[model samples]
Target: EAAQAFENLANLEQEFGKAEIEILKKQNELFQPLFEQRRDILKTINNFWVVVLEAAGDEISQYITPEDSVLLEKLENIYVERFNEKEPRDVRISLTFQPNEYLQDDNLTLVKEVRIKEEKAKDDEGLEKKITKYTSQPVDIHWKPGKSLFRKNKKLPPNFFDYFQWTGEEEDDDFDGATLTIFLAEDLFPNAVKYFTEAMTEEASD
Candidate 1:
């Protein structure tokens, strides 16, 4: 409850002005006891989920050889306190594992269109045998005459505020919400690595 209060306070700061902030400090004082209250409770809440994620390491600890690894789960993300809560939150974990490859936002550039080349046994229309024009010499960066294949990169649109009401360009890539975040239950799924593994292996939601 108090943590939620703190989070709500943080969010409220975004909308309030200097005067409003001064007012918020008063509201904030109400949670002073909540903040200082939980050495033991906080410690347990903090430590419990972590133990589960720690247990998960053993779940996929041994890869089913190198060959069967393809069939193993890629581990998209983990959830906590999914269901069954007798072990306190039941010590329950749900996992959904499948073989899939998703390009990381930063690594999207690594993906490329497949390139097929040269006729192994050329026998179609007018075809040449020796094509010396390849990656041997790396030039042609800046533009000059008809040899301009690339140009300078433009500024990112998200540099400015997203509050524009007029002339908003159609949403291009996911620039608006580019920053991704995982959902960790402050009350559940706290320890990511260890608890995450145990939860997924024990209860694969997928």
Candidate 2:
């Protein structure tokens, strides 16, 4: 009787596992597409803004001239009046045209080229020409023809003002104490692969 009871319980556990798997499969079919569509929309919006800012900078460059002392002032007023009419408090603008020494290399330039000198090393470990797995962030920096615009959110840290530091030719002048940052939305927690997978599935459905 004991052996029969044990076999019965084992069969019940197997049925329960099968039932849970079916439920998960159904849930994936129902909600995965919606989640992915939302993700793709967000990503497209982000990329679109980056392109928009780049284009805006290009347009503004046409007005800049050596003789125009009031160029920047006039341009700022025009941009503010135009952008405020549309976005109000949702938008902000900053303009920089001169080539910065720190951003000499374009965004696509590899990390190996942007080598950190020993003097600029953050720790006592020294600049050993260490290749980081996440070195792509520096390479993707859009520091080209003009300044880039950034969309602000509440997630930005209190020390965000430090981004304006002009690190000149001296290697030691660069930001050593600065920490690396990658901002993400509150809902997009955990590994990116999971989020991307859901996004891909949603794309397929469309």
Candidate 3:
């Protein structure tokens, strides 16, 4: 048993990788502070929006959210809205809400992301080839300091809310597919935290 166990552990990725199973939980540990902070920030955003409304008073009518509010849209016009995931990589994106009825245009943030990779396949003639496939991923989050549009030109201090962007090639991308572009803000975060228990793990959560 000892020798066999040692042999089995030798190629962790291969043996573990080939196991015929659904997306396995590659790694797990104690309360991860990494996700906890993002979780809290989302909570704060949910609660703080009301304060933004309160501050607006009568002018509150000027701003508006999508009918679903916390939910964001998944864009599919690849050219118009593309992650260009030609390789396995994580993406950092930021979105700005115009705080008005027409929120779509101001949603410049690639907050949601998609990743892609080639899949092995055979043609009718028995030639092996690769096919492109992808999925959506949530951003790696942290409580970034920033102000809301409610204060507009007043130049208020940072610390209200935020999104993400790139930091150079450090590690693999934490995210995947166009399906994600359709996800809502409130709907996206919890799943991001849950799916990334080990984050960019050896097998990836896919």
Candidate 4:
């Protein structure tokens, strides 16, 4: 009887997962055009991205060094794409910048493809249980000419852009870069107005 109960519990969890993904996909569709319009309006505001980044919370703002701050001043727009239709965890984030002396490339993009696998693992009681494991593809950043932020900023603290090329010795499901990606996709992209408001308040205080 307990075995059947466990099976039903697992099935119920799978149903919840599917329903959650369905909602995420529908939300992405609704937000797509709204984000496009927001970007259009945001272009009129000067230093919108830089302000938003600085106010994105300390967990992220801490990586933005002074040098990075100058470079990010040219940031024009940030676009986030969620691939919930394919994999709920898949995301693509692209940052566009105006013509700047430091970077020849106009855009920096990161796309991570999430892979899921079902595996058996021992529970606290030593009994085997099925677990859903998530792993993602490593991302690479393209730098143009002598415009590598990581190279020039060596010995200084890690720059925010460094996360674009972050790949450890082994694949980690909870890596910093992936966490940042998820944050950008799920949180920052949606509630950017709040962050921008906070940024404006901080600017007024100065």
Best by lDDT: 4
Question: Which of 1 and 2 is ahead in lDDT?
Answer: 2
Model 2 per-residue lDDT tens digits across residues 109-155: 21211112223224566634432221111223453345432214323
Which pairs clash in model 4? none
lDDT of each: 0.31, 0.32, 0.35, 0.70
lDDT at residue 99 of model 3 (Cα atoms): 37
Q: After superposition, how far is residue 101 of candidate 3 from its true place, in Å?
A: 12
Find the candidate with the highest TM-score and give its number: 4
Write one digit per residue (lDDT tens) for candidate 1, span 3-75.
9998999777656645554554554456335533522243334233334433534332221233223322233
Question: Please, what is the TM-score per model?
Answer: 0.19, 0.24, 0.24, 0.78
| Superior by TM-score: candidate 1 or candidate 3 | 3
Q: What TM-score, to 2 decimals, does candidate 2 have? A: 0.24
* Segments in model 2 whose C-alpha atoms lie over 4 Å from true places: 45-206
RMSD of each: 24.3, 19.4, 17.1, 3.7
Tens-place lDDT digits, model 3, residues 62-143: 2234332332222211111222333323233344342333233435333545454546879999988766554443344332
| lDDT value for model 1 | 0.31
Ranking by lDDT: 4, 3, 2, 1
Q: For candidate 2, which ten residues in a row score worst on lDDT?
A: 73-82
Error of 1 at 11 (Å): 46
